[PDB]
């Protein structure tokens with residue numbers, strides 16, 4: 629299905645939508661998040677490690693290093709590969725959705741998150757990366773909102789069928805209609 | 811002076827069983843630690859000074875990160891975190907005493923990620939975020955460590971002792987046991 633037709637951008641990051649006479653307000657940041665999670669999750673989209681131009685070498689504490697080692701397998705399932713020596717880790721590849729992020733901030737952030745876990749699972753790591761570590765977004769445009777919803781419709785069919793309250797809300801016309809008649 | 815009571819024993823590697831005027835309680839040492847550090851980092855709740863690193867930490871930042879840092883510069887300086895910025899990078903020149911022995915190559919990027927998502931910047935709010943992201947103190951707490959921590963918390967956070975939140979301290983009900991003995 630579909631969220632409908634994008635009508636206009638509301639308050640820099642929402643999209644006013646129309647579907648069968650119904651008007652809705654959708655949060656683009658929330659939609660972007662669901663999209664990224666699906667694109668990063670093995671089993672919901674193609675996952676292929678992408679080589680870094682220049683590998684990112686980082687110093688890590690022993691507890692971080694140890695966390696990285698236990699997570700190696702989960703990370704590789706996400707397309708995140710690295711090698712490491714005594715005091716460092718060097719990121720050699722990341723999945724496509726991450727290739728254009730600022731990895732000098734994202735990876736150290738991922739490392740901090742990983743150093744706090746007891747269990748490592750690609751699914752939960754993808755979700756975390758999708759919600760917290762990714763590129764913030766400035767003013768949204770129509771072209772961007774249109775593209776986003778289309779991608780979300782394609783990869784997250786379920787969101788369409790049952791959109792949470794933080795994703796899309798009903799814009800009630802009854803008051804205006806009544807006010808026009810009355 | 812006012813206190814949480816007498817430390818009786820360590821429970822679950824990170825909690826402390828307390829006794830105060832006949833009442834028994836369980837206190838989360840990690841939570842107590844976070845309040846202590848939050849206090850040590852908050853201007854007005856404890857002394858704050860800027861200590862230079864012997865090796866400035868340079869980091870690449872996105873326009874959005876760059877911008878966020880710009881807006882938070884004053885609040886950060888109040889916390890003793892000083893930095894310089896050039897086109898694409900920022901260089902941390904100094905950090906408060908409680909952050910000297912941390913993994914800044916991980917913590918600063920996390921702080922930057924956190925700041926990039928804020929709209930309002932206040933030293934108090936930022937210090938709270940920092941205290942919650944410092945690497946967990948110990949792992950297996952000892953009696954001496956808990957006794958020392960609590961004495962410090964008592965002097966720097968007198969209000970916690972008066973109104974200990976439920977995340978910090980919980981009552982251990984002896985009534986069932988007393989009834990059972992009967």
Ligand SMILES: [Cl-]
Pocket residue numbers: 637768769770771
């Ligand atoms: Cl537009």
Ligand SMILES: [Cl-]
Pocket residue numbers: 769770771772
């Ligand atoms: Cl447009």
Ligand code: NA
Pocket residue numbers: 730733734761762763764875922923926
């Ligand atoms: Na970021």
